[PDB]
Write a protein that binds this ligand. Structure first.
Ligand SMILES: *Cc1c(COP(=O)(O)O)cnc(C)c1O
Ligand SMILES: *Cc1c(COP(=O)(O)O)cnc(C)c1O
Ligand SMILES: *Cc1c(COP(=O)(O)O)cnc(C)c1O
Ligand SMILES: *Cc1c(COP(=O)(O)O)cnc(C)c1O
Lengths: 442, 442, 439, 442
């Protein structure tokens, strides 16, 4: 059940007058480099719809980059936020604590993988979460080196930029970057030089390289996204992640799962790592956790997190009570409405339609992902060469028909589906039809 | 002025009470042990100058969540704005689908920050993100690497902001290695200058020569300084220091960054601490008080600098969250409607009056600050040696009587007053009386 | 014509009494970690022979890690050093200059690739050369990033460690390392995941990765050894080095050829890059340059090197006059006796015998007097470090000092002095062949 | 007893024809930035004379920046080099070892301070020596941070540049620099803001700062020159350090004495540290060690150096046998001719003449140093402001009269005397007379 009409409706040209008026105001005061993928301005966002200030209704297939999984205005989230703000907006947990922080903390302990003792700390952004996961690995192990992977993305702070692989736009001219970060090869099936390579073998390749170029006993942490987001929704070959996990344990290296984008039901399991039963030492969370409010978290082994000295990890706003209220409600919605199930259903529907399209066409190089985190990598006809032009064009074409869809990828040639999990089959199918028509059209 | 909950200090028997204890017991199973709180009671409602715990005790709030809830922890306007905004949409990510709130907050910061030159703004979540982004801009726009920070600086808990931060315990220990090309220079700290007669101008010349000799003016991307150093101990530089640095920075093409995360938005009796001396920073970093307790941060600076950054270079998922933006617009509005600059100046007159009365009856080394950002540095009797023991003891003694007061300082020996600006004279005086009694008692 | 008898001769067991006496002294005073590959102590070294203090004569197939290419006591070098030391040992070129520095500088300008305007600065070690090449690239381009490759080795200072790939023993526990160094995939034919990959294709793989992970316009320098030394005498596929060079020029990136080990006739050309006609923007030199004396150099484009401010590049000892005298003589010997030719001849002989030896032999590669055999496990490509250690020991036992190397510790390398006789080289190769068969 | 006539003798204008011919050759082939302080080219250098290719004889008051302490062609050194080179030039100690290395190693063990177990490794340059000291400290302690001081100079590699304080010309545009280097205040009596400050107090200032900004238990090494060379022959106040040494021992910090310039009799003791009886954990050596040949060394505690793994420390050329021969002879000369005594005698003579000059004048700010490492810091008349113009001019004036004298200093205003220790009283006095005349003249 939804608040605004759940269907695609574009009345004439856009941006309309009220959107244009905002754009004109914007350019006087927001940095020129801060661009938006969409030229219309939101007034209301709900279910699978973004409704602009000129009354146009777009299908939302991005969920704010995997954030509003429960929907951009889930009643429970809205109510919780409204109620919490009336009591106190902020007291800073490090100064005067409050139940909401503890309570979110309890849920994450429960929902994250593994049955060992775990603890949590809360912050605001994904980047802060990753920063803190690395702080903990480094202090707990007494080591320096952190290994990250090709096609990784972990944020826009200096260290998270360091950890991030792609330079444009995330890194160019922003260095020099945090030291002792090393990059290793990813398991990226569609582009392996030897297509027959196994997950285990891909892991062994990474492991040998780490051992030879750093040494296992010198690495504080291995950080990897179980499904690489901005890198192009790269899913590693079966057996890769477990091999890295096993080896990390052998060598006393903290294995950090970055589930900022893949976490909270997005992939059809609570965490992406659940697909293969990998149990990370620390896991970083944000985006979907708090139904749109700014919250992030690390949850990991008690012995690691409890190693940090008093006052070592923190922040002013972190674990904001209004955001915490949002999170508790968001997680509750995830359970009450079985969003894991909705995500699995979305996979079945969307991959169905996409494979139909593959069978008609060829520009469709690879279809991959899980749950509500799906992607199609577009290539040049009859080869594997990347096709960024087609990708840019298809996104624009979709936008023209009233479908907001996101792109990504190291080579700028991956269309990604990140719909809110509460999206109706009707709307999703409509969106997928527009997408399929766009690809055919170009 | 008028409030929601009774504005009186009221402690019913021993605390933490039962409901607080229950929360502490829950907390220790799930929150990392290093995340400590200064206060053992759990908030239920925070309003005006009072923190009311879950067991019905009412403490005087002389910390405002570390300078965050300047307008109060539940300002009706803020609360209303948050409630209203959340009902429309919690998040769409400005970089994907933009929205008025972002632009509007951006318009206000342009207007309220110093200088009449062309300015632009980008929004993020935390103070650390803000400082990170200022440095990104300075580095890209100047084409240089080096950033100078000062003794007693504090700028955050990410890797770079830790690098910029001076004090190692607890902010840095075992969390490195730290981001490169950060250089540290001597601060103007009157009370501890080896030559007590030194002038602000002379202190600036000392810093400038050192920068020139050890980096070179044309090699420095940015000088970053807090006009009043917060965690460092509410250090106010001698008159003439900040302008000298500013003038020189302009000479050498160096971006002068004012970190006003803690001192900004009326805290000091002016909109920004730099306004006391009429310094006009090239970029200024903001958070804490900006959004009445919601998680928001900002950089506002010269258009030519910020606009230099390439499309997509600066950003974040949550940044400039719409619910937070609503909160900021309301918070800023309250600051104007109720003349919080005036309230801050009044707080100064009152608080410095009572503190100087106490000095006049020695363990009180220095009284300093301005507006609602005031401090007393405690020393050993009859010398200038730091007295952390007395500082810890006074904070504890205050808490016991129902007054939550914060401490700070490089040497752990500074009591700081950061009351909310909406505090009543009655409550402030009560708090100051408790403070004065506590110092005398120990 | 040689000074000491050019015959392999081991009298009984070693280390002998005088060597043992030195080892006993050594352990009281030299750091324990500083180990030597050979347990005997040199008294005289000449031609292809190392003669120890107990009168044993070993065949020298390492030339001090590619240093004594002209021989460990070339008469010309010896005479020049003796003469120069009598006038002055040192005045520091940055204070009071002298002809020797300028002269060495003239020769390097002449002998290095390319006809464009070039300039030179001198230092002491290979690591100092590389450090200075990077300083110049960074200042001239105004950029930060430097790319190095898998299997690279460039030295033991903090930055050169950073540039170096292998952690044991060069890096472990010695960091944190100099920032803004990025590592890219090498063209290593024998271990390519796709054995059919081309040099051009391997270069494209590296280039795309650089572009995507740094950006061409952000890179101050690409640094590569034309033949990777300590990494295992890895020779890249034809077309790789020129592609990188072309691209570097396109993007304003300084292309640094690290020829510290491969330079000065070692590969049968003056510089390894000459095999493919690549013309580096800066080239780093040491080892062979001064016939054993401590000297190093960078030689590169005038417009790059001249960009550095007065006093920016230097050092106290750098371009030492005694070492310069040695270099001029060494280079002279290289020409007078056509050591390039001797090197090409050593290749023909050595590669001949090594190919006859062919299973435990994975790959035979190299050029001139810089040759190698990579040993694997029988019937696979898995590395065989055990066999490699054992063969080196077996050769030592028979009076042949031979060096090993490689990322996986499984490469036997031939680095004989270029003045070695065919008789001695064949003898050494026979001992090597016998040792491999033996294990 | 000497080889060439020990008298100052300039025949007409210079550079003469043969020098000019070399300059013309030079400019075609040496980088333009590589400048020389002296426009004439050496043919022979012996005793206290540099004789150029046009037959002019200059007094040498620089000894090649403190290198040719035994003289630029000491017969013993010359003979030893000649003999050694005939046997073998190089075999690489790590491959085939040799007596010369071991022997030099024995002497350094014997001559360095302390009676504890010591070990040595050899390299080529001073920078390599410092690099290796730091490698050992870092591995042996398991820590990262290295503290260096204001006015320090340690070399021109990336890390030694990092350690070095002054940017022009050593650092400008050559970064980014090696991470985890921290800079602390030096004891520099002449420029202390509080002139009455004590060495012990100065050390306490540095120590507190280290403790507060890094933490004692986080520092791998403290590296300091007992007399700072290029920084301006700064001698710390008595008691400085010993206090640093005592504290380093308490905190498990490796204390590195950089004696590359001050070592081997230069100050009138074998090492500058011997003046105050400080016993460093590692000591770095080069310059004077091998009478002009390229050699350097670290000598330190067995337990520290032996901690390094096999193959960890090394180099190709390091401990070159011809250089080793030189060193043994050079050390032998130092003993046979009591160069410590000669240095002490030089001090008495030179400081005598310099203080006479101070009495006549005022432009002479400070006279300091020990042994044959002496300096006069020149200031503006009647103040402490630096006088780089006078300094440049005096050096030029001296050169004109046939005296080659070096300058140095953070502020470019220090004339330094680094004569070879084998210089005759007659020549030294002549040189000092020219110097005194030059200062008076300008
Ligand atoms: C979005 C993202 C981040 C950074 O999160 P922010 O909240 O934008 O700081 C980090 N890691 C991954 C894997 C992400 O997808
Ligand atoms: C609190 C503080 C910061 C960091 O802000 P967070 O939001 O706590 O990351 C930065 N700068 C100053 C001056 C501060 O007081
Ligand atoms: C040996 C080596 C160096 C280091 O030279 P040193 O003089 O030992 O510092 C640098 N680069 C390469 C390619 C080498 O083989
Ligand atoms: C000259 C100097 C060095 C550097 O030695 P080089 O051989 O020139 O690398 C190091 N330390 C000190 C104290 C010096 O004066």
């Amino acid at each position: 059940s939804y608040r605004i009409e759940q269907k695609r409706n574009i009345n004439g040209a856009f941006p309309g007058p009220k959107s244009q008026a905002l754009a004109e105001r914007r350019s006087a005061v927001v940095a020129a480099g801060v661009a938006s993928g969409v030229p219309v301005y939101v007034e209301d966002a709900d279910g699978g719809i973004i409704r602009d200030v000129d009354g146009n209704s777009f299908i939302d297939l991005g969920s704010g980059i995997a954030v509003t999984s429960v929907g951009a205005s889930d009643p429970a989230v809205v109510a919780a936020v409204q109620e919490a703000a009336a009591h106190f907006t902020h007291t800073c947990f490090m100064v005067t604590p409050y139940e909401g922080y503890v309570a979110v903390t309890e849920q994450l302990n429960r929902l994250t993988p593994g049955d060992h003792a775990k603890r949590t700390v809360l912050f605001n952004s994904g980047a802060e979460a990753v920063e803190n996961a690395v702080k903990v690995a480094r202090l707990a192990t007494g080591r320096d080196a952190v290994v990250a992977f090709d096609h990784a993305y972990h944020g826009r702070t200096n260290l998270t930029m360091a950890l991030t692989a792609k330079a444009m736009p995330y890194k160019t001219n922003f260095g020099p970057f945090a030291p002792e970060v090393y990059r290793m090869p990813m398991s990226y099936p569609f582009r392996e030089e030897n297509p027959e390579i196994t997950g285990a073998e891909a892991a062994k390749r990474a492991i040998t390289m780490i051992e030879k170029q750093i040494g296992g006993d010198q690495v504080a942490a291995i950080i990897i996204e179980p499904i690489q987001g901005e890198g192009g929704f790269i899913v590693p070959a079966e057996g890769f992640l477990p091999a890295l996990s096993e080896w990390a344990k052998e060598k006393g290296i903290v294995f950090i799962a970055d589930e900022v984008q893949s976490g909270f039901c997005r992939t059809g399991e609570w965490f992406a790592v659940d697909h293969e039963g990998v149990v990370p030492d620390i896991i970083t969370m944000a985006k979907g956790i708090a139904g749109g409010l700014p919250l992030s978290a690390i949850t990991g082994r008690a012995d690691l997190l409890d190693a940090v000295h008093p006052g070592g990890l923190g922040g002013t706003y972190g674990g904001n009570p209004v955001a915490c209220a949002a999170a508790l409600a968001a997680i509750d919605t995830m359970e009450q409405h079985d969003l894991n199930g909705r995500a699995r259903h979305i996979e079945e529907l969307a991959l169905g339609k996409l494979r139909e399209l593959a069978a008609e066409l060829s520009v469709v190089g690879d279809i991959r992902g899980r749950g509500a985190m799906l992607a199609i990598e577009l290539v040049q006809p009859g080869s594997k060469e990347p096709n960024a032009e087609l990708t840019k064009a298809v996104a624009a074409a979709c936008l023209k028909e009233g479908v907001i869809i996101l792109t990504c990828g190291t080579y700028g040639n991956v269309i990604r589906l990140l719909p809110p999990l509460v999206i109706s089959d009707e709307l999703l199918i409509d969106g997928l039809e527009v997408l399929a028509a766009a690809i055919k059209a170009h």
